[PDB]
Write a protein that binds this DNA or RNA. Structure first.
Ligand SMILES: Nc1nc2c(ncn2[C@H]2CC[C@@H](COP(=O)(O)OP(=O)(O)OP(=O)(O)O)O2)c(=O)[nH]1
Ligand SMILES: [Ca+2]
Length: 344
DNA sequence: GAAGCCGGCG
DNA sequence: TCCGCCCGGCTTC
């Protein structure tokens, strides 16, 4: 198992820098707004000059200006960032036996057969990938090379920005021993707080505690996952799937409960969603906003995926099922979501 | 099966 | 130390 994890450096801001080179070297902030009850905005991405002045993602925009008065504040343009992401993902495509797209800026590559099981050529490949993405798209990325997915990510994370993390087969055991508990994917701040207040600060501190004492705080799946990881037993493979969802939402001319009216609009959302997709989804979800604006949704999974034609029937049903769950209340806006896409 | 609560993520 | 046509795990009825 040779995994190369690729993560695009401050992606949205970096794209803005490429389109307008005048921002390069100046503090830049990409802003995301909301048209809900309040119209206020927040930080989506800050470049490193902004991050250096203390600007972080999710920071309310008002606050970011307090600490970065000198920064340039721009609106978010998803479609462009998506186009970039699309292009770069394709470049990676031809460098991997198997490729898993995790998000708009994160991919995992299995390169084991590519580099003939030789870990050194694997590192050489990562360097090539870095170099190519920079030359083709003028985007700098951070990569992580490791025997499994989770390590490959965890080391890239320690190597940002424009870095190249490497954990070799022989370094693994020590690395697990070395690892702080909160540094591990799946453990947010809240879980860490609770784990530290029970004597666990490092990954190897799990071994001494009994599985039941752990579960109580952890859950079920995480406990198991932690156990295997600490013992270096984790090795979930890289799959040919994209974790990025694609959806279309359409407003109705007026509020209704009538399927014959809603369907033509659902059918259109489905069409537009399937055009955005480059594979076969394994889940369809019908989302419906009611008069009082609250959300009602429901999906179905398909082991072997759903094709465009067969989605009309299923989506229709899901809609009826939503209308049987909420009787005597009209819809306003419908949408469909497609995820768990199988690639290639 | 499914509503709702909670931690985590992008 | 913030929001999501959020999203999955888990607990509960
Ligand atoms: N509201 C909010 N949005 C966030 C937050 N973190 C990320 N986002 C959204 C906006 C940008 C997008 C990508 O963020 P990422 O951290 O995945 O990636 P990045 O911007 O390249 O930075 P990095 O390389 O450090 O991960 O997801 C957050 O804490 N709050
Ligand atoms: Ca990134």
């Amino acid at each position: 198992m040779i995994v190369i994890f690729v993560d695009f450096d401050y992606f949205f801001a970096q794209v803005e820098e490429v389109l307008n080179p005048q921002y390069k070297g100046k503090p830049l902030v990409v802003c995301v707004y909301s048209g809900r009850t309040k119209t206020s905005g927040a930080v989506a991405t800050a470049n490193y000059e902004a991050r250096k002045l203390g600007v972080k993602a999710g920071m309310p925009i008002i606050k970011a200006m307090q600490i970065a008065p000198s920064a340039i504040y721009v609106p978010m343009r998803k479609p462009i960032y998506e186009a970039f992401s699309n292009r770069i993902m394709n470049l990676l495509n031809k460098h991997a036996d198997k490729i898993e797209v995790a998000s708009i800026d994160e991919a995992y590559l299995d390169v084991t057969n590519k580099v003939e099981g030789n870990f050194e050529n694997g590192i050489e490949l990562a360097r090539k990938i870095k170099q190519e993405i920079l030359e083709k798209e003028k985007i700098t990325v951070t990569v992580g090379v490791a025997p499994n997915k989770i390590l490959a990510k965890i080391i890239a994370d320690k190597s940002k920005p424009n870095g190249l993390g490497v954990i070799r087969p022989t370094e693994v055991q020590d690395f697990l021993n070395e690892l702080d508990i909160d540094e591990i994917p799946g453990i947010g701040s809240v879980l860490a707080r609770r784990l530290n207040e029970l004597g666990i600060q490092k990954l190897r501190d799990i071994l001494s505690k009994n599985y039941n004492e752990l579960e109580k705080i952890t859950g079920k799946a995480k406990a198991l996952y932690l156990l295997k990881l600490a013992q270096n037993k984790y090795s979930e493979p890289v799959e040919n799937k994209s974790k990025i969802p694609h959806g279309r939402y359409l407003t109705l001319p007026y509020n209704t409960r009538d399927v014959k009216v809603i369907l033509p609009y659902l059918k259109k959302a489905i069409n537009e969603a399937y055009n955005k997709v480059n594979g076969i989804p394994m889940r369809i979800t019908v989302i419906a906003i009611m008069e009082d604006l609250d959300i009602l949704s429901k999906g179905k999974k398909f082991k072997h995926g759903i094709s465009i034609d067969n989605a009309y029937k299923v989506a229709e049903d899901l809609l009826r099922e939503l209308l049987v769950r909420d009787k005597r209340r009209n819809v306003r806006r419908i949408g469909v979501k497609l995820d768990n896409i199988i690639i290639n």
